[model samples]
Target: NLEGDALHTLRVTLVDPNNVLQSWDPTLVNPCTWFHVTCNNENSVIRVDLGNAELSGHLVPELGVLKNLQYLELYSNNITGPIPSNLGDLTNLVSLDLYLNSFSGPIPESLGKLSKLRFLRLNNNSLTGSIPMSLTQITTLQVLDLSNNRLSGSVPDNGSFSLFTPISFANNLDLCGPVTSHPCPG
Candidate 1:
């Protein structure tokens, strides 16, 4: 009941011009019947694939309610605004894809809570501010790509950050660190 309610909130909040979300019937009792949504054996949401759907609008903080969610495919869209700090609550999230979107503002420090995250693709957004030190705590992170944003400041090169090269922080306003081989200013 709560799952469908949370999804329904997304349905109304987003601007899906092509009716790609037409299959999302709020009256169905559960979102398992929804096209883009997939539920696990326990009738809980596990994934929601809606990439490149030409959708716009901001993400709702209510999405944090989907605790069972593992993958969120929302890339290559016109979606704009802030990356909700509420997303950090998705501990089960393995891959958080929001690449090529219009997202701005600092990458939420709360994202460090997702210990299960292995693939974090926040590249090519309008994002700004310093890299979060908390992100360095994710030992599971592997495919990290923060390129082409307005991000500035130093990027950590210890722990999981050690695995990444300069490509991760490419094309930013200013990023100087060990990984980038560009030493930070004194």
Candidate 2:
């Protein structure tokens, strides 16, 4: 019931213009056989691929219930609202791609809990606020793109961020630090 609840909640919240989510049937007992969803041997969900689905709606906090989820691909949609802080609950997450959406609000500091995360791309959104210092703690983070957002404050140069270039935080007009060639205000 945990997994089914999460996915169903997502289905109801989204406006699926292309009907791509039509296969998300609630009476199916489980979402393992559903389109764009993958499960492991235990029938536990581990992957959810819904990129460019033209879904326009805020993400539900229930999504965090998929503890086994490894990848969350929801890019190039019209989704809006804050990235649910609950998402930080996905400890097994490997990649979280939510780029080119209409998402707003500060990046949830809770996301810093994703110790296994490798690729994090939230570019081309309306997200604002300071980059969570906790994000710098993700040692396994291989790719991070917060570009084209409204984020502010100085960028961290420690931890995994040490390997990132200015392009990672580009188009965030208010962001400063050596990364953007604009020093933070004293």
Candidate 3:
């Protein structure tokens, strides 16, 4: 199925030194039986659990094809490059964790489309640019850990943003706003 094709795409691109992805055979009709992958009753891919597995390699925009994906745990790895903007298409996402990586570039503003999103953690990365104000639209957000990044400019403090504090955006390049002591437009 096309879902298996997408997962296989990710498997090939990644360098799994531990051979943890050996079970990812693309010929399978349903990848639900594959390790580190989960599917719903409808056989729709839902979660991708690949955190802290020592995996490396950039992501594929084809990953956006998993429309039912609720969680994307790719943190604590060596993966680098821009976060695929196509990911914003996963409106069913509940948590988007990509922290503790070498990933650089701007956080896709398209991520704001994840209306069901709860936890958005991208801390401890080389990511640049200001935090996307569009993220504030996700009122379902519960945990926002943007600390330890290269982000600058004011932290948008509206909508779901009101649920976070300065600690959430700590250790950045120069983030100024009501949340931090560094006031804006001095």
Candidate 4:
């Protein structure tokens, strides 16, 4: 099991400014007792659902330390920074929601390693760069919401991405191909 203090310290360092986690009082030593926490049958921390908390800041790479974590919901925050590529280490992850944040940079290609991922929502962020083709490797992907971002370039148009329409990519930098009438840059 992970250390309780380490978990609490990690939370304090996050970008949540709306005090959405007022319950996460630093006075307490163990975050396991917090509301957003969930333990497994073995009493191991597994899920951390903190969605729409108005959080902001770069996603720390140390988050990958949670070895048993299965679900991580930090969507609708004002977060800004690169998607920690090290997050690929979380092979046990089943659901990941980090959408509607101020996050920038490219979607980590490392995320393609999640074999069990069923839901991924990274929409409404300041993310730039083309969608990583590596994402197609995740066969278990079901709900993907990369819409309403600054993404550009030709979408994978293979496998899952092929199923989405241009409407799925309404406003972006300069995306082209079958998804939109906008011609590719010359």
Candidate 5:
């Protein structure tokens, strides 16, 4: 099926040291039976559970094709590289957890398009750049964490971000703003 191909792309990109993804065989017509992946009644993928799987690899842009995806849990792995900007296409995403990885680069502003996203955790990585203002537009956001990265620039304290405390951005290098208590350079 179309979604299986997208998942196959993920299987190809990641190095599964523990054989955690062994069930992701491409011979299947659909991925609903694949371990750690879930689908709705329509056979459309809705959830992916890969956290703490001891896997390492960059995420593939093909993941954006899972239009019905609601939960993406890939935290506590050795995954590296920039987050696929196309992931913003998962309009139904409710929780995204990529923490404790080696991912670097800017948080894609496209993620702001996920109006249903409520939990976003990207801490303990090597990401850089200003927090995308577009993310503040996610009014449904309830929990956000960008700590322990290399991110710099002024942290915005408006919109949904108003609910977050400085701890959410703790351990980043050079981040400044009223919330951080480190004024941005003039």
Candidate 6:
């Protein structure tokens, strides 16, 4: 699929009811040569901005194919599914925005492996379970928005998590500990 102009081919296989990607014409072919598509000096794709596009459904694993992708803006859509673990394969990823969707499932432990990650927004969804401790390893993270969802359990209130305030974690399921009034079992 990476051989020729397959980005346009790839866009069609995935649904885009809002025609947000209508500009993506297969006739032109090469996705690497499309608009809003950032490529490295070597012509490899490094970013794809599809946020607030009214898209829906599970994130296709094909996303991982963009090994050099840094920013994936899919927030504010109706997308759902357990976050593809393959995303962790993108060692170059700098930000992952999946807020305001219907994704439900535990935060994948593999995400901690993103050494270059600086922003991770997975709130405003139906995600459940405790916060993954693996995330504590992302020393470069500056913003973590987990509000407006159904995430339940204790949030690590020390180390990297110390940067957050109650506002960043509002409108969720059960949230306890020093941040909130109720702390879980010691």
Give each prediction's root-mean-square deviation over alpha carbons.
0.8, 0.9, 0.9, 2.7, 1.0, 2.6
Query: What is candidate 1's lDDT per residue for 1-186, written digit by digit as tens?
Result: 888888889888889989899988878878998999999999999999999999998888889999999999999998889999889999999999999999999999999999999999999999999989999899999899999999988887898999999988899998998997589996
State how far residue 86 of model 4 sits from its true place (Å): 1.2
- The TM-score between candidate 2 and the true structure equals 0.97
Writing each residue's lDDT as its tens digit, candidate 6 over 2-28 gives 612445654655467867776665565
lDDT of 6 at 141: 82
Q: What lDDT score belongs to each candidate, Candidate 1 first? A: 0.92, 0.92, 0.92, 0.76, 0.93, 0.76
Taking all chains together, each candidate's TM-score versus the true structure is 0.98, 0.97, 0.97, 0.84, 0.97, 0.85
Model 4: per-residue lDDT, tens digit, 53-166?
766756667778777789988887777778888888889898988888888888898998888898888878878888888887888888887778888897756766666677
Candidate 1: the clashing residue pairs are none
* Model 3 lDDT per residue over 31-70, tens place: 9999999999999999999999899888989899999999
User: Residue 145 of candidate 4: its Cα lDDT?
Assistant: 77
Residues 1-186 of candidate 5: C-alpha lDDT, one tens digit per residue: 889999999999999988888899878979999999999999889999999999998999999999999999999999999999888999999999999999999999999999999999999999998889899899999999999999999988898989988899999988998677587786
Off by over 4 Å in 1: none
Which has the better lDDT: candidate 1, or candidate 2?
2
Count clashes in each candidate, considering only residues at least 3 apart in sequence or on different chains.
Answer: 0, 0, 0, 0, 0, 0
Better of 3 and 6 by TM-score: 3
Runs of candidate 4 with Cα error greater than 4 angstroms are: 1-6, 17-19, 22-30, 179-186
Instruction: Give per-residue CA lDDT, model 2, range 8-115, as digits (tens).
Output: 899999898888988888788789999999999999999999998878989999998999999999999999999998899999999999999999999999999999
